[PDB]
Amino acid sequence: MQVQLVETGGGLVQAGGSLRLSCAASGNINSFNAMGWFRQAPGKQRELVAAITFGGRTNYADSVKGRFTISRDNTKGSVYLQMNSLKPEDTAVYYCAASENNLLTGVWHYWGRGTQVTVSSLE
Numbered sequence: 001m002q003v004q005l006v007e008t009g010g011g012l013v014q015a016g017g018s019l020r021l022s023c024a025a026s027g028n029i030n031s032f033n034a035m036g037w038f039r040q041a042p043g044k045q046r047e048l049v050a051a052i053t054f055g056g057r058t059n060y061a062d063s064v065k066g067r068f069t070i071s072r073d074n075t076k077g078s079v080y081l082q083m084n085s086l087k088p089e090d091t092a093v094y095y096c097a098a099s100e101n102n103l104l105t106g107v108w109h110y111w112g113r114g115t116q117v118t119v120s121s122l123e
Contacts (some may be wrong), residue, residue, distance in 0.1 A: 003027040003110050005096045010115030013086055015122050021081040023096035023112060032110060033102035035072060035079040039092035040114070046095060050081060051104040059104045064090075086119045093117075 009021040025032060036051035049061040050070035058070050069082045079096060094117055097108040 001027050003031055003098065005098060005110055005112035007094060007096045007112045007115040010094065010117050012118045012120065015087055015119050017086055017119075018082070018084045019086065019117060021083070021094055021096075021115065021117070023079050025077045025079075025098055025110070029074060029077050032098040032100060034099040034104060036097045036104070036108065037070060037079075037081045038095040038097055039090075039117075040095070041089075041092040044092075048097075048105070052079060053102050053104065057104075083117075088119050088121050091117060091119045 004026045005023050007021055007023045009019060013019045033054040034051060036048055038046040038048050040046045047061065049064045050068055052058050052070045052072050056072060060068065067085045072079045093114040095114040096112040098110040099107055100109050
């Protein structure tokens with residue numbers, strides 16, 4: 001079976017709150033290395049906001065630095081996105097992606113179907 005990615009954890013969240021997204025990759029862990037989270041806000045391209053090498057080294061989009069943390073557990077074939085200090089501007093469809101290779105910028109060979117995260121303002 002080809003590797004498959006299913007994101008969990010999406011939903012509605014209040015601004016200032018937090019949310020963890022998770023993705024298990026099915027199949028053979030040896031067939032992928034780098035993993036990442038993309039987000040597509042309405043009207044926008046899918047934007048890579050966090051990526052992680054097989055060994056755990058990370059890179060973040062400037063727009064999420066200091067607020068989001070990407071991590072992984074290879075014993076569970078999983079990658080996680082802990083999103084703190086959420087803002088309305090973080091509302092988007094969040095996609096997990098994976099690569100056969102171990103670079104933080106592509107090529108993204110495998111994609112989940114995405115999960116919606118909606119951050120509502122307090123005012």
